[PDB]
Homo-oligomer: A and B are copies of this chain.
């Protein structure tokens, strides 16, 4: 069974509201009219009234909720709260009226205030433009130094990871993580694995080196980050530096890194930077026939996800479903 089928089913059990801002694109409506249709969640649409019922065509959205930045009965405290976290960044009140009238923003500040549980977009903008709303308004969770991105990778005939399932991170967002930032990526991705795959994360800090099989600036960066992460999170089994083969293969691990809590069992792969992360994941997907999921964001304070530039609405129902389960990571 599919990770996304598993997830979307778990996501139906919950009750969560997802504010989709891309209300001028007709995919973000094909998506919208299947959320309410399967019980995946409830879902806000952020944008002009003239768009909705006229654009998509004939699809039932009475189950949906329309809120325009210039219609809602609370729109005033949005130009105000935005101006409270841009309180240090040069933008006045009518500039806080220029930025906010955009749909992405209103969908994001609704999350910050708990009017909405989460946000999915990226499909019609990019991964530069999308994450600003996610950073400036939402900010991050407490046990989190940054917003990062990741991918769930399912490898077909595979006796590695968690039944062929892995989290790769960061493979989306963070171009050049510093050693501090890497260590945190490990910790935060462990909690995401647990949440989404529902298995014990064994986190591998990757490298061409394995426990000093080589030595350079590169290795030492990872070395350090392993050991930073091992402190941040003692309860989480975390090791580095590991090559991939030692990371996943008992026989190999047994000789390259004897008595490791991770080597030979890995299911979370952590990369030195985004050349590595993004190469690794595409290589899995295309040469290993792995199914890939993401980019999904993590370490955020309330879930807000990005989308591959070009995609279908069936992917979006996927993303919306993850934004739900994610949305059930703190409320307890």
Q: Which residues of chain B have C-beta atoms less than 8 A from A289's C-beta?
A: 157, 288
Beta-carbon contact of A214 and B128 below 8 Å: yes
Known A272-B275, A275-B272, A290-B287; contact A244-B282, beta-carbon cutoff 8 A: yes
Q: How many residues of A contact B (CB 8 A)?
A: 47
State the CA gap A255–B309 with chains docked (Å): 9
Would you call A32 an interface residue if the criterion is a C-beta within 8 Å of the partner chain's C-beta atoms?
no
Smallest beta-carbon distance A187→chain B, Å: 20
Interface contact B310-A255, CB-CB below 8 Å:
yes
Q: Which of B157, B160, B176, B276 contacts A216 (CB 8 A)?
A: B176
Contact A275 B128 (CB under 8 A): no
Chain B residues near A283 (CB-CB < 8 A): 244, 280, 283-284, 287-288
Taken together, the copies of this chain in the complex come to 2
Smallest distance from the beta carbon of A253 to chain B beta carbons, Å?
Answer: 12
Whether B208 lies near A175 (C-beta < 8 A) is yes
> Does A273 reach chain B (CB closer than 8 Å)?
yes
A176 to B273 Cα, complex, angstroms: 14
A127-B243 Cα distance, complex, nearest whole Å: 15
Q: Could you tell me the distance in whole angstroms from the C-beta of A224 to the nearest C-beta in chain B?
A: 14
Q: Mark A278-307, 1 if CB is under 8 A from B, else 0.
A: 111011111111100000000000000000
Q: Tell whether, in the assembled complex, residue B217 and residue A176 are in contact, meaning their CB atoms are under 8 Å apart.
A: yes
Bound-state CA distance A243–B207 (Å) is: 20
Q: Show 18 residue pairs from A and B whose CB-CB distance is below 8 angstroms, ordered by the A residue.
A: A128-B214, A155-B287, A171-B208, A175-B219, A176-B216, A207-B275, A208-B278, A208-B279, A218-B275, A244-B282, A245-B282, A248-B286, A271-B279, A279-B279, A280-B280, A280-B283, A284-B287, A284-B288
